Amino acid sequence: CPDAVYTCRPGQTCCRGLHGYGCC
């Protein structure tokens, strides 16, 4: 995620992708 305040689903975290951001 872009911001440092984004809660992701249980077991994953804010990940950075080539097409864009998103939780792992």
Side-chain angles (χ1 to χ4, degrees):
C1 316
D3 238 44
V5 186
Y6 270 71
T7 176
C8 293
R9 265 225 177 181
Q12 54 220 92
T13 184
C14 276
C15 268
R16 194 177 304 183
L18 314 183
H19 275 74
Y21 282 97
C23 310
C24 261

PDB file of all heavy atoms in Angstrom:
ATOM      1  N   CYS A   1       0.827  -1.201   0.000  1.00  0.00           N
ATOM      2  CA  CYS A   1       0.000   0.000   0.000  1.00  0.00           C
ATOM      3  C   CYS A   1       0.866   1.257   0.000  1.00  0.00           C
ATOM      4  O   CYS A   1       2.006   1.255   0.465  1.00  0.00           O
ATOM      5  CB  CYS A   1      -0.928   0.005   1.216  1.00  0.00           C
ATOM      6  SG  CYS A   1      -1.728  -1.597   1.548  1.00  0.00           S
ATOM      7  N   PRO A   2       0.312   2.357  -0.531  1.00  0.00           N
ATOM      8  CA  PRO A   2       1.016   3.640  -0.603  1.00  0.00           C
ATOM      9  C   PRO A   2       1.200   4.279   0.769  1.00  0.00           C
ATOM     10  O   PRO A   2       2.299   4.706   1.123  1.00  0.00           O
ATOM     11  CB  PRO A   2       0.096   4.501  -1.473  1.00  0.00           C
ATOM     12  CG  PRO A   2      -1.259   3.907  -1.294  1.00  0.00           C
ATOM     13  CD  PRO A   2      -1.042   2.432  -1.103  1.00  0.00           C
ATOM     14  N   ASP A   3       0.118   4.340   1.538  1.00  0.00           N
ATOM     15  CA  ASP A   3       0.162   4.924   2.873  1.00  0.00           C
ATOM     16  C   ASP A   3       0.660   3.907   3.895  1.00  0.00           C
ATOM     17  O   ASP A   3       0.646   2.702   3.645  1.00  0.00           O
ATOM     18  CB  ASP A   3      -1.223   5.433   3.275  1.00  0.00           C
ATOM     19  CG  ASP A   3      -1.220   6.910   3.617  1.00  0.00           C
ATOM     20  OD1 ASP A   3      -0.590   7.689   2.873  1.00  0.00           O
ATOM     21  OD2 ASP A   3      -1.849   7.287   4.629  1.00  0.00           O
ATOM     22  N   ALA A   4       1.101   4.401   5.048  1.00  0.00           N
ATOM     23  CA  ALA A   4       1.603   3.536   6.108  1.00  0.00           C
ATOM     24  C   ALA A   4       0.507   3.213   7.117  1.00  0.00           C
ATOM     25  O   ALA A   4       0.778   3.023   8.303  1.00  0.00           O
ATOM     26  CB  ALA A   4       2.789   4.189   6.804  1.00  0.00           C
ATOM     27  N   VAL A   5      -0.731   3.151   6.640  1.00  0.00           N
ATOM     28  CA  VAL A   5      -1.869   2.850   7.500  1.00  0.00           C
ATOM     29  C   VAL A   5      -2.956   2.104   6.735  1.00  0.00           C
ATOM     30  O   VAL A   5      -4.050   2.628   6.522  1.00  0.00           O
ATOM     31  CB  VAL A   5      -2.471   4.133   8.105  1.00  0.00           C
ATOM     32  CG1 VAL A   5      -3.565   3.790   9.105  1.00  0.00           C
ATOM     33  CG2 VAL A   5      -1.385   4.973   8.759  1.00  0.00           C
ATOM     34  N   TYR A   6      -2.648   0.880   6.324  1.00  0.00           N
ATOM     35  CA  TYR A   6      -3.597   0.062   5.579  1.00  0.00           C
ATOM     36  C   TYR A   6      -3.628  -1.365   6.118  1.00  0.00           C
ATOM     37  O   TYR A   6      -2.700  -2.144   5.900  1.00  0.00           O
ATOM     38  CB  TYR A   6      -3.237   0.050   4.092  1.00  0.00           C
ATOM     39  CG  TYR A   6      -3.892   1.158   3.300  1.00  0.00           C
ATOM     40  CD1 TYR A   6      -3.501   2.481   3.464  1.00  0.00           C
ATOM     41  CD2 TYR A   6      -4.904   0.882   2.388  1.00  0.00           C
ATOM     42  CE1 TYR A   6      -4.098   3.497   2.744  1.00  0.00           C
ATOM     43  CE2 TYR A   6      -5.505   1.892   1.662  1.00  0.00           C
ATOM     44  CZ  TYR A   6      -5.099   3.197   1.843  1.00  0.00           C
ATOM     45  OH  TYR A   6      -5.696   4.207   1.123  1.00  0.00           O
ATOM     46  N   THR A   7      -4.703  -1.701   6.824  1.00  0.00           N
ATOM     47  CA  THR A   7      -4.857  -3.033   7.396  1.00  0.00           C
ATOM     48  C   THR A   7      -5.247  -4.049   6.327  1.00  0.00           C
ATOM     49  O   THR A   7      -6.276  -3.905   5.668  1.00  0.00           O
ATOM     50  CB  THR A   7      -5.917  -3.046   8.513  1.00  0.00           C
ATOM     51  OG1 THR A   7      -6.109  -4.382   8.989  1.00  0.00           O
ATOM     52  CG2 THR A   7      -7.239  -2.486   8.010  1.00  0.00           C
ATOM     53  N   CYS A   8      -4.420  -5.075   6.163  1.00  0.00           N
ATOM     54  CA  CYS A   8      -4.678  -6.115   5.175  1.00  0.00           C
ATOM     55  C   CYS A   8      -5.290  -7.349   5.832  1.00  0.00           C
ATOM     56  O   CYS A   8      -5.285  -7.480   7.056  1.00  0.00           O
ATOM     57  CB  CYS A   8      -3.383  -6.496   4.455  1.00  0.00           C
ATOM     58  SG  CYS A   8      -2.705  -5.178   3.397  1.00  0.00           S
ATOM     59  N   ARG A   9      -5.816  -8.251   5.010  1.00  0.00           N
ATOM     60  CA  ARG A   9      -6.432  -9.474   5.510  1.00  0.00           C
ATOM     61  C   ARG A   9      -5.490 -10.209   6.461  1.00  0.00           C
ATOM     62  O   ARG A   9      -4.286  -9.955   6.499  1.00  0.00           O
ATOM     63  CB  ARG A   9      -6.816 -10.390   4.347  1.00  0.00           C
ATOM     64  CG  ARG A   9      -8.262 -10.237   3.904  1.00  0.00           C
ATOM     65  CD  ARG A   9      -8.921 -11.590   3.680  1.00  0.00           C
ATOM     66  NE  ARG A   9     -10.331 -11.458   3.321  1.00  0.00           N
ATOM     67  CZ  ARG A   9     -11.133 -12.493   3.097  1.00  0.00           C
ATOM     68  NH1 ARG A   9     -10.664 -13.730   3.194  1.00  0.00           N
ATOM     69  NH2 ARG A   9     -12.404 -12.293   2.775  1.00  0.00           N
ATOM     70  N   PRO A  10      -6.050 -11.140   7.247  1.00  0.00           N
ATOM     71  CA  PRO A  10      -5.279 -11.929   8.211  1.00  0.00           C
ATOM     72  C   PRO A  10      -4.345 -12.924   7.530  1.00  0.00           C
ATOM     73  O   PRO A  10      -4.792 -13.820   6.814  1.00  0.00           O
ATOM     74  CB  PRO A  10      -6.357 -12.667   9.009  1.00  0.00           C
ATOM     75  CG  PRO A  10      -7.523 -12.747   8.085  1.00  0.00           C
ATOM     76  CD  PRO A  10      -7.479 -11.493   7.254  1.00  0.00           C
ATOM     77  N   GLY A  11      -3.046 -12.762   7.760  1.00  0.00           N
ATOM     78  CA  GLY A  11      -2.070 -13.654   7.161  1.00  0.00           C
ATOM     79  C   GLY A  11      -1.227 -12.967   6.106  1.00  0.00           C
ATOM     80  O   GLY A  11      -0.142 -13.439   5.765  1.00  0.00           O
ATOM     81  N   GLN A  12      -1.725 -11.850   5.587  1.00  0.00           N
ATOM     82  CA  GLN A  12      -1.010 -11.098   4.562  1.00  0.00           C
ATOM     83  C   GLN A  12      -0.744  -9.668   5.021  1.00  0.00           C
ATOM     84  O   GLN A  12      -1.193  -9.255   6.091  1.00  0.00           O
ATOM     85  CB  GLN A  12      -1.809 -11.086   3.258  1.00  0.00           C
ATOM     86  CG  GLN A  12      -3.235 -10.588   3.422  1.00  0.00           C
ATOM     87  CD  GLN A  12      -4.229 -11.380   2.594  1.00  0.00           C
ATOM     88  OE1 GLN A  12      -4.812 -12.355   3.066  1.00  0.00           O
ATOM     89  NE2 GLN A  12      -4.428 -10.961   1.349  1.00  0.00           N
ATOM     90  N   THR A  13      -0.011  -8.917   4.207  1.00  0.00           N
ATOM     91  CA  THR A  13       0.316  -7.534   4.530  1.00  0.00           C
ATOM     92  C   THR A  13       0.400  -6.679   3.271  1.00  0.00           C
ATOM     93  O   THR A  13       0.346  -7.195   2.153  1.00  0.00           O
ATOM     94  CB  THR A  13       1.652  -7.436   5.292  1.00  0.00           C
ATOM     95  OG1 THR A  13       1.900  -6.078   5.672  1.00  0.00           O
ATOM     96  CG2 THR A  13       2.801  -7.948   4.438  1.00  0.00           C
ATOM     97  N   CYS A  14       0.532  -5.371   3.457  1.00  0.00           N
ATOM     98  CA  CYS A  14       0.623  -4.443   2.336  1.00  0.00           C
ATOM     99  C   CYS A  14       1.822  -4.774   1.452  1.00  0.00           C
ATOM    100  O   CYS A  14       2.973  -4.646   1.872  1.00  0.00           O
ATOM    101  CB  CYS A  14       0.733  -3.005   2.844  1.00  0.00           C
ATOM    102  SG  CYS A  14      -0.870  -2.229   3.231  1.00  0.00           S
ATOM    103  N   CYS A  15       1.545  -5.202   0.224  1.00  0.00           N
ATOM    104  CA  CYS A  15       2.599  -5.552  -0.720  1.00  0.00           C
ATOM    105  C   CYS A  15       2.605  -4.597  -1.910  1.00  0.00           C
ATOM    106  O   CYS A  15       1.581  -3.998  -2.241  1.00  0.00           O
ATOM    107  CB  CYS A  15       2.418  -6.991  -1.208  1.00  0.00           C
ATOM    108  SG  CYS A  15       3.319  -8.230  -0.224  1.00  0.00           S
ATOM    109  N   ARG A  16       3.763  -4.460  -2.546  1.00  0.00           N
ATOM    110  CA  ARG A  16       3.901  -3.576  -3.698  1.00  0.00           C
ATOM    111  C   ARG A  16       4.051  -4.381  -4.986  1.00  0.00           C
ATOM    112  O   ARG A  16       4.930  -5.235  -5.098  1.00  0.00           O
ATOM    113  CB  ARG A  16       5.108  -2.654  -3.519  1.00  0.00           C
ATOM    114  CG  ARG A  16       5.128  -1.482  -4.485  1.00  0.00           C
ATOM    115  CD  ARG A  16       6.302  -0.555  -4.212  1.00  0.00           C
ATOM    116  NE  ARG A  16       6.307  -0.067  -2.836  1.00  0.00           N
ATOM    117  CZ  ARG A  16       7.195   0.802  -2.367  1.00  0.00           C
ATOM    118  NH1 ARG A  16       8.145   1.277  -3.160  1.00  0.00           N
ATOM    119  NH2 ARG A  16       7.133   1.198  -1.101  1.00  0.00           N
ATOM    120  N   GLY A  17       3.184  -4.104  -5.956  1.00  0.00           N
ATOM    121  CA  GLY A  17       3.236  -4.811  -7.222  1.00  0.00           C
ATOM    122  C   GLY A  17       3.644  -3.912  -8.371  1.00  0.00           C
ATOM    123  O   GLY A  17       3.729  -2.693  -8.216  1.00  0.00           O
ATOM    124  N   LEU A  18       3.899  -4.513  -9.528  1.00  0.00           N
ATOM    125  CA  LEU A  18       4.302  -3.758 -10.711  1.00  0.00           C
ATOM    126  C   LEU A  18       3.129  -2.963 -11.275  1.00  0.00           C
ATOM    127  O   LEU A  18       3.280  -1.806 -11.667  1.00  0.00           O
ATOM    128  CB  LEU A  18       4.854  -4.702 -11.779  1.00  0.00           C
ATOM    129  CG  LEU A  18       5.845  -5.761 -11.293  1.00  0.00           C
ATOM    130  CD1 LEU A  18       6.368  -6.581 -12.461  1.00  0.00           C
ATOM    131  CD2 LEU A  18       6.996  -5.108 -10.539  1.00  0.00           C
ATOM    132  N   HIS A  19       1.958  -3.592 -11.313  1.00  0.00           N
ATOM    133  CA  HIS A  19       0.758  -2.942 -11.827  1.00  0.00           C
ATOM    134  C   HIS A  19       0.187  -1.965 -10.803  1.00  0.00           C
ATOM    135  O   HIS A  19      -0.513  -1.018 -11.158  1.00  0.00           O
ATOM    136  CB  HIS A  19      -0.296  -3.988 -12.194  1.00  0.00           C
ATOM    137  CG  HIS A  19      -0.134  -4.542 -13.576  1.00  0.00           C
ATOM    138  ND1 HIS A  19       0.865  -5.430 -13.918  1.00  0.00           N
ATOM    139  CD2 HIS A  19      -0.851  -4.331 -14.704  1.00  0.00           C
ATOM    140  CE1 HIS A  19       0.756  -5.739 -15.198  1.00  0.00           C
ATOM    141  NE2 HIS A  19      -0.279  -5.087 -15.698  1.00  0.00           N
ATOM    142  N   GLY A  20       0.492  -2.204  -9.531  1.00  0.00           N
ATOM    143  CA  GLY A  20       0.001  -1.338  -8.475  1.00  0.00           C
ATOM    144  C   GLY A  20       0.211  -1.928  -7.096  1.00  0.00           C
ATOM    145  O   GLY A  20       0.908  -2.932  -6.941  1.00  0.00           O
ATOM    146  N   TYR A  21      -0.392  -1.305  -6.089  1.00  0.00           N
ATOM    147  CA  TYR A  21      -0.263  -1.772  -4.714  1.00  0.00           C
ATOM    148  C   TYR A  21      -1.309  -2.838  -4.401  1.00  0.00           C
ATOM    149  O   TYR A  21      -2.153  -3.160  -5.236  1.00  0.00           O
ATOM    150  CB  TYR A  21      -0.405  -0.602  -3.740  1.00  0.00           C
ATOM    151  CG  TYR A  21       0.836   0.254  -3.637  1.00  0.00           C
ATOM    152  CD1 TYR A  21       0.957   1.429  -4.369  1.00  0.00           C
ATOM    153  CD2 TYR A  21       1.889  -0.111  -2.807  1.00  0.00           C
ATOM    154  CE1 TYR A  21       2.090   2.214  -4.279  1.00  0.00           C
ATOM    155  CE2 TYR A  21       3.025   0.669  -2.709  1.00  0.00           C
ATOM    156  CZ  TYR A  21       3.121   1.830  -3.448  1.00  0.00           C
ATOM    157  OH  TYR A  21       4.251   2.610  -3.354  1.00  0.00           O
ATOM    158  N   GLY A  22      -1.245  -3.384  -3.190  1.00  0.00           N
ATOM    159  CA  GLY A  22      -2.192  -4.408  -2.787  1.00  0.00           C
ATOM    160  C   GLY A  22      -1.622  -5.343  -1.739  1.00  0.00           C
ATOM    161  O   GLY A  22      -0.411  -5.552  -1.675  1.00  0.00           O
ATOM    162  N   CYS A  23      -2.498  -5.906  -0.913  1.00  0.00           N
ATOM    163  CA  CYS A  23      -2.077  -6.822   0.140  1.00  0.00           C
ATOM    164  C   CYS A  23      -1.623  -8.155  -0.448  1.00  0.00           C
ATOM    165  O   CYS A  23      -2.062  -8.551  -1.529  1.00  0.00           O
ATOM    166  CB  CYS A  23      -3.218  -7.052   1.132  1.00  0.00           C
ATOM    167  SG  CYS A  23      -3.999  -5.520   1.736  1.00  0.00           S
ATOM    168  N   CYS A  24      -0.743  -8.843   0.270  1.00  0.00           N
ATOM    169  CA  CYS A  24      -0.229 -10.132  -0.179  1.00  0.00           C
ATOM    170  C   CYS A  24      -1.186 -11.260   0.195  1.00  0.00           C
ATOM    171  O   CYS A  24      -1.878 -11.809  -0.662  1.00  0.00           O
ATOM    172  CB  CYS A  24       1.149 -10.395   0.431  1.00  0.00           C
ATOM    173  SG  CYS A  24       2.540 -10.008  -0.680  1.00  0.00           S
TER     174      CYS A  24
END
